[PDB]
Structure formats: C-alpha cells, structure tokens
Ligand binder design. Structure first.
Ligand SMILES: [Cl-]
Ligand code: NA
Ligand code: NA
Ligand code: NA
Ligand code: NA
Ligand code: NA
Lengths: 206, 186
C-alpha cells in the first residue's frame, strides 16, 4: 500500500576506463519496488537515455559497455523506483568516468628465492596486470605496490614497485615464512584490492 | 633523443594533472561543497570546440601529426587562463595558500611541457605548419565579478576544465609515446 522510498545511486566504478558500472540501493523506508529505471543524459546533449544493461552488473546495477562509456564528458544520472502505488526518484548524480577508476587486482603473483654465488641472496617477486586493462597502447597506466609480512608481525613492509612487473627484496629473515600480496592503481584513481597472498618460506641457509 | 624527451614530457603532464586534480578537490571542499556548482559547470570549457578523441579507438585512428598538434593547441590555449588564475588569486588579501601554490606551479610547469612538446614535434614532424589555431578563453569578467556566487561558480568551472584538460593532455601523451616509441607495445 506504500510507494517506494527514495533510492540512492551510491557507487560507480570503472575497472579500465573503457566500461563502468553503477549501483543503487532502495530507500528505507517505503514500499517494495517492483521496477527501477535508471536514466541519464550527458553534458552537451539534451537526449535522455535508459541504462543500456541492467544484467551484467548484478542486482540493482547499471552497466555501461564500451559503446556507452567515454571519458571527459559528465554523465548526469537518476534512478526511479516504482510500484503500483507510486514512484520515487533519486537525487541526480554527476559522474566523470575519469575519477571513478579502480582496477581489479594484479594476477599471477609468484615468488622465488634466489641465491647467487658471492652476491646477496634475494626474494624475486613477479606478477601480471589485471586482464581488463590496455597498457600496451598507452590508454591505461598502472603503478604497483607489494606488501609482505610474517604471521604475527604487527606491521606489513610495503614496497612501491612503480610500473615494473617484477621486484627484488633483500632483507628477509632466514627460516621465516612470509605472506606476500600486490596491488595496483592507475595514474589517476583508486588502489585495487590486494591480490590473494602467495606464501614463501625463506630457507635457513639464506 | 625521443625516448628521453617523451619520458620527461610524461613526468610533467602526470605531475600537472596531479596538481590540477588536487587543486580542484581543495577548492571544491572549501568553497563550493555546499550549493549547486557542479550542476552549473555543465558544458562550458573553452577547449570544447577542438575535435578531441573521446575514447581509445578514436585516439588510435588519429593521424599522429594532427594528434600531437592537438596537444600543443590545448596547452597553448591554457596560457591565458592560467595567467589570470594566478594573477587574480595572488592579488587577494587573503589568498588560500595551498590553492595559490598549486596554480603557480601548474602555470610554470605547463610552459615547460609546451616547450618539450614543441621539441617533440620538431623531431618527429619537422615540416609542421607553424600557424596557431587554438581556442580563445575569454572568461576574465566572470572571475572578476562582485557577486560571490557567480564568481565562485566561474572559478569552479575553470578548475573543473583544467583538471579535465590536464588529464586529457597526460592521457594523449601516454598514447602517443606508446604508439611512436613502442608501436603500441608498452
Ligand atoms: Cl585509494
Ligand atoms: Na564495468
Ligand atoms: Na539492475
Ligand atoms: Na567507449
Ligand atoms: Na573530466
Ligand atoms: Na596462486
């Protein structure tokens, strides 16, 4: 018997500056919505458009594929929640895809102990970029950070690796097991989540 | 030495965009955070009339000489507004220090980046046409208006446009570096 509460578009994210997704939540408190419609227009245009993909991004989301995503051009978007009793509209949200970029984590993190003759031994760390990103053309640029720590240590040691996909670490404690993770961020935007840990035992004879 | 020139140009363009992004964020938190200034900043950049690529596919399609030309035109077009930004702000009795410091650094570093860009063009495209065609900024009256709201909105739009164009310049330079030096295998 009640119209929906006021919905709110609470998050938008682009993993690769080529697509993006936005998510909304219902209002508490009002009736159950039976439909939502996300509409938007772009700076410089009067045309109103509907969300082109309500499926890809899962529940209460709008996914903008490559055909609908462009940088340096503000999206002005709104979501309405309707049921047979009435309707409610979110506040407008202004989105520049440029400033919502947060890559997925790096991949294939691998760690190896190297012990060369008469030179310092070292932990050799290697990884790959997230799959969705185009570094090769220069469209996207990634920076990386590694962290590692033994269990029960209070602090992670953090190493900024710049744009490399490998890294050498020298001062490690012989016999100790370390957890290592990597994360990445664009030149402009948000750090990814840390990758899952890879584990490494540093040999006693180190 | 093209690799060294490109490397230094990209250090500058990424540093400039960083400063512009932080300037815009600091102005926004401090003056405009509470009132409809972001709605007011829709469609109103002096560089909008340039044909600029809007995605990597248009970028890839751009003739290399014209793409470099375009970066140069955007940088040349910002000389005038950056000068007035700094002049106006520095001329205040109580100049917001962090904002002023960023504006003066961007003003200075943009000149250097334009010099690096002109050297690039000289090396890669020595018979470029030396005629200028860049878009004119003429928004000084709105920066100088007594109406505090119209004035803040003029500053908002200038800073939003700066952050956008500094980003585009950086992203276009990174595209060109990778295309020129690495055949798009960076
Ligand atoms: Cl972050
Ligand atoms: Na997406
Ligand atoms: Na949906
Ligand atoms: Na696109
Ligand atoms: Na922008
Ligand atoms: Na693994």
């Amino acid at each position: 018997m009640l119209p929906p509460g006021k919905p709110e578009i609470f998050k938008c994210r682009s993993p690769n500056k080529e697509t993006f997704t936005c998510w909304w939540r219902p209002g508490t408190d009002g009736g159950l919505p039976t439909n939502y419609s996300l509409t938007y227009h772009r700076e410089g245009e009067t045309l109103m458009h509907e969300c082109p993909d309500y499926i890809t991004g899962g529940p209460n989301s709008c996914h903008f594929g490559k055909q609908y995503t462009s940088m340096w051009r503000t999206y002005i978007m709104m979501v309405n929640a309707t049921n047979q009793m009435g309707s409610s509209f979110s506040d407008e949200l202004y989105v520049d895809v440029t400033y919502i970029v947060q890559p997925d984590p790096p991949l294939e993190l691998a760690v190896e102990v190297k012990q060369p003759e008469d030179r310092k031994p070292y932990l050799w760390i290697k990884w790959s970029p997230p799959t969705l990103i185009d570094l090769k053309t220069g469209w996207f640029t990634l920076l990386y950070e590694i962290r590692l720590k033994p269990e029960k240590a209070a602090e992670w040691e953090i190493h900024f690796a710049g744009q490399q996909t490998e890294f050498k670490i020298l001062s490690l404690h012989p016999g100790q097991k370390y957890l290592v993770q990597v994360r990445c961020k664009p030149d402009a935007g948000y750090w990814s989540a840390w990758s899952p840990a890879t584990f490494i035992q540093i040999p006693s004879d180190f | 030495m093209l690799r060294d020139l490109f490397d230094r140009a990209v250090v500058l363009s990424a540093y400039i965009h960083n400063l512009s992004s932080e300037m815009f964020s600091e102005f926004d938190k401090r003056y405009t955070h509470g009132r409809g200034f972001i709605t007011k900043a829709i469609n109103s950049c002096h560089t909008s009339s340039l044909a600029t690529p809007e995605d990597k596919e248009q970028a890839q399609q751009m003739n290399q000489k014209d793409f470099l030309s375009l970066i140069v035109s955007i940088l040349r077009s910002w000389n005038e507004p950056l000068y007035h930004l700094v002049t106006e702000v520095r001329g205040m009795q109580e100049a917001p220090e962090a904002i002023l410091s960023k504006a003066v650094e961007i003003e200075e570093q943009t000149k250097r980046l334009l010099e690096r860009m002109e050297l690039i063009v000289s090396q890669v495209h020595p018979e470029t046409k030396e005629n200028e065609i860049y878009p004119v900024w003429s928004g000084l009256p709105s920066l100088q208006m007594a109406d505090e709201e119209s004035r803040l909105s003029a500053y908002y739009n200038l800073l939003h446009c700066l952050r956008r164009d500094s980003h585009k310049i950086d992203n276009y330079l990174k595209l060109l570096k990778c295309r020129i030096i690495h055949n798009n295998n960076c």
